[PDB]
Amino acid sequence: VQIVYK
Amino acid sequence: VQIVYK
Amino acid sequence: VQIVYK
Amino acid sequence: VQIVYK
Amino acid sequence: VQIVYK
Amino acid sequence: VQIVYK
Numbered sequence: 001v002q003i004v005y006k
Numbered sequence: 007v008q009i010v011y012k
Numbered sequence: 013v014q015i016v017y018k
Numbered sequence: 019v020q021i022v023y024k
Numbered sequence: 025v026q027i028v029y030k
Numbered sequence: 031v032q033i034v035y036k
């Protein structure tokens with residue numbers, strides 16, 4: 001699982 | 007699973 | 013599963 | 019976003 | 025974001 | 031973010 005907030 | 011907020 | 017918000 | 023594997 | 029593996 | 035492996 002990868003989660004990214006930019 | 008990959009989730010990305012840009 | 014890939015989810016992308018741009 | 020909700021993802022569920024059962 | 026909620027991810028669940030069961 | 032909540033991730034759960036069961």
Ligand SMILES: O=S(=O)(O)c1cc(S(=O)(=O)O)c2c(/N=N/c3ccccc3)c(O)ccc2c1
Binds near residue numbers: 004010016
């Ligand atoms: O957390 S980071 O900002 O460091 C970050 C951000 C991304 S990314 O913005 O999702 O691009 C990636 C990444 N991207 N993978 C996609 C490929 C195609 C579509 C969408 C995403 C990847 O392959 C490897 C590492 C990454 C690290």
Ligand SMILES: O=S(=O)(O)c1cc(S(=O)(=O)O)c2c(/N=N/c3ccccc3)c(O)ccc2c1
Binds near residue numbers: 010016
């Ligand atoms: O999260 S990211 O912004 O880093 C991101 C965004 C996309 S994308 O905007 O969905 O293009 C992709 C991607 N695209 N795959 C499509 C191919 C045809 C139609 C629609 C989408 C891909 O093949 C690999 C990594 C990606 C990483």
Ligand SMILES: O=S(=O)(O)c1cc(S(=O)(=O)O)c2c(/N=N/c3ccccc3)c(O)ccc2c1
Binds near residue numbers: 022028
């Ligand atoms: O991760 S859990 O297993 O704990 C899980 C699993 C589900 S569920 O299997 O998607 O049912 C739900 C859920 N369901 N929402 C639907 C309503 C109508 C159709 C499809 C789904 C809900 O409203 C609230 C919490 C949930 C927690």
Ligand SMILES: O=S(=O)(O)c1cc(S(=O)(=O)O)c2c(/N=N/c3ccccc3)c(O)ccc2c1
Binds near residue numbers: 022028034
């Ligand atoms: O890490 S724990 O195992 O302790 C765990 C596991 C879950 S759960 O399996 O995702 O059910 C939950 C939870 N569930 N939330 C859903 C609601 C509807 C659908 C899917 C999920 C919740 O509302 C609060 C705390 C939880 C703690």
Ligand SMILES: [Zn+2]
């Ligand atoms: Zn990046």
Ligand SMILES: [Zn+2]
Binds near residue numbers: 006
């Ligand atoms: Zn930003």
Ligand SMILES: [Zn+2]
């Ligand atoms: Zn990117």
Ligand SMILES: [Zn+2]
Binds near residue numbers: 012018
């Ligand atoms: Zn932005």
Ligand SMILES: [Zn+2]
């Ligand atoms: Zn992209």
Ligand SMILES: [Zn+2]
Binds near residue numbers: 012018
């Ligand atoms: Zn935008």
Ligand SMILES: [Zn+2]
């Ligand atoms: Zn459930």
Ligand SMILES: [Zn+2]
Binds near residue numbers: 024030
């Ligand atoms: Zn099962």
Ligand SMILES: [Zn+2]
């Ligand atoms: Zn549960």
Ligand SMILES: [Zn+2]
Binds near residue numbers: 024030036
């Ligand atoms: Zn199981």
Ligand SMILES: [Zn+2]
């Ligand atoms: Zn639980």
Ligand SMILES: [Zn+2]
Binds near residue numbers: 030036
């Ligand atoms: Zn188990």
